[PDB]
Design a protein around this ligand. Sequence first.
Ligand code: ZN
Lengths: 105, 389, 123, 234
Amino acid sequence: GLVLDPKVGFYDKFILLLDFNSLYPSIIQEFNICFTTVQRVIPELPDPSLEMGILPREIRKLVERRKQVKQLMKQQDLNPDLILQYDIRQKALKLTANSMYGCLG
Amino acid sequence: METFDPTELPELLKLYYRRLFPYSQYYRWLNYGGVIKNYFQHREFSFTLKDDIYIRYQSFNNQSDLEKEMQKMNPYKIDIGAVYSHRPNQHNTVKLGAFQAQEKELVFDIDMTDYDDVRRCCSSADICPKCWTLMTMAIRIIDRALKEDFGFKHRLWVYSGRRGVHCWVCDESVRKLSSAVRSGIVEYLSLVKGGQDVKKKVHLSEKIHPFIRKSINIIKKYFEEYALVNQDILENKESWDKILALVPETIHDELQQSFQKSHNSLQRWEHLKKVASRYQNNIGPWLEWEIMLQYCFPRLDINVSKGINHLLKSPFSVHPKTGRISVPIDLQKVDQFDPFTVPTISFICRELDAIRTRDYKKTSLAPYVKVFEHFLENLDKSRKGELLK
Amino acid sequence: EQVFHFYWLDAYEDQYNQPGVVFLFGKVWIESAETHVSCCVMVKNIERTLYFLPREMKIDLNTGKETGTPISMKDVYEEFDEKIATKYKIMKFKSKPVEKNYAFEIPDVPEKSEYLEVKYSAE
Amino acid sequence: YPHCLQFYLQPPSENISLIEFENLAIDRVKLLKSVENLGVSYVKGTEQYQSKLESELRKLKFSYRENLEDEYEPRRRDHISHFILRLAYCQSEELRRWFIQQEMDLLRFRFSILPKDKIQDFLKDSQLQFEAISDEEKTLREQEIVASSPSLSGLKLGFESIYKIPFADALDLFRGRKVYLEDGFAYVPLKDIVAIILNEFRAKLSKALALTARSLPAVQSDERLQPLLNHLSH
Ligand SMILES: [Zn+2]
């Protein structure tokens, strides 16, 4: 990972600290990276014309289910126990994914 | 030529692919003398079988496989693709990205549905003696180039089956050309800028490059024989209204009375030859040639030659509709080439029934099989010449 | 015939001592008590399943070269049945030819190919 | 300036003092940062440009005095300097562009200085295959060469030397029917021949700046090279 040299020093005005949402997790999606997409033996991202492979097709569902859940959490006149339910089921589907990477490296 | 009966096709096919096709010569060709690893074992071929089922990445070990599997599948269609880096019949075997097209001939396709606005004798999909001059012009126009312009030596034209003609650029250095260059080729050899139905589709500039000028020279020996007597391109106003649409509006009125008082296109062409000529001097655009162009110059399909992996109809195959054999061309006699006399698979299967194997000789298929041999011989030359020297 | 339900939790296998058997712990419900109780279920006869990668050409492994004879599944079968089975003490087994993909870190291995599916007792 | 036009191809195997290693870069940049200015305040065809340009090329010692076969002072400076400054400018795709941009504005100048003659020798020799045609084949096919050429005014096929290249290498020009082709050969002048050089030069350079990054992780570790990687414009 890259590290940009920190501008040691004080700050009078505000400092907006932006970030990315689940980086390598998404990247393994963006560039269809997989055990059946990439050419290996720092290879080259296959072409955007190749279809998903096992790995993306399991990170696919991984957010296809975070879709449903994020949407059922929108429903009202709903069980305030299922509120706390859906919330966790969220965080999980989240963790699993991210480490999907830590799984390969 | 008797009516080709397309219900007999399933019968004739197994008899033709059994005893009349040139397997010996087809191998010897795509094999290119085993000068290299697996140039045939890595060559792709495509077959359209029964019910219209379309299979593709076929491949074989030797001349023998070719027969068994082609006498055991009796395809209606057959195509030759390119040679890849791994056995086509084995791409499931390899990783996805290491299997790729590396080499294929440089083929040019010229059909009749490309001049659907220049002919006044046939419908888009048909042909006859009267407009076939268009395939002969395309022939010496590009064959001319490929040889003169680029130095491509082994060009094999074949009969497409009903309304066009194909080219197989087989020089060793060509089979390995990058697609990018192949596009450059067609770009060079292309002049009809047919937009989304634009009247004037041939614009020239004051300086006219060699090919352009050599081409116009070969569109001149056929011009009046075809356009003005066979086609009579300007016998009606409906007909001439169409050729005026290329010339500058201010010229019409004068030509319109010029052909009104004339009595056949031959005199009507000499007429614009003047008016326009007179147009040129005081104003040039070369009005005389731009029209001979938009009417006589070949129109190719970029997608065909561009793709180094494109499946194109295999020589000596059989056309399901007309039945005719897709025969190689004899460039020593281009202008004598007859699409109408080309052997019918029905007809050739009749000539073997009215009868170490050479029975292809006993059929009228034989004459086209020799032009294919002179081809294999001129190639033997190259290998021999170029290598053993 | 007869059957019961139960939500599990953990499990365990004793390869050393009891191979081909795994224990599923969990919970079962019992009307008689109006509360669920711990509950263990044993699973026996879990056959080891193996996959053999046929070669494209039969090879004399000693020297290291072909014999001119192409390979078929029946070829592999009889190599296990007669030369590998005995040497390693395998009396009965199950062999079935099947199509199987692949895409990991072993050089010279087809992403797809027919293999020799062999299954035999964990013992 | 002299046999000073060189395709920065094939890596320097020498070795230097962290004093030369550091000075080759600071300097090699000062130049490249002057190629940048001149292109901003003047134009690519002015004397001031050509002048000052070779003036610094001079002052920074990158085209001058000779020596015994091996050690050619400026030859060397420019060879290393470039490669070394491939490290620094390989990262940001905004530096890779800027680099290529100014290291190509440079090959251009070192070409704008040589006469239609010296540039010829450099090609024959350079990569590998190119040929010139005698005034026999030259004038024999003269008219046809001027017909295939651009809006090129007049019928004047000047003294301007003409070359014969593989049709394939001139794709960029025969595709538009902008040169004469014969039995698989194209005939083009200097202008266009050069642009093709510059063209293939960018594409190869970019290609490299690519393979420079990939293997950069194996040095960022070194302490002496932080001031280069990180601070050549801080
Ligand atoms: Zn017709």
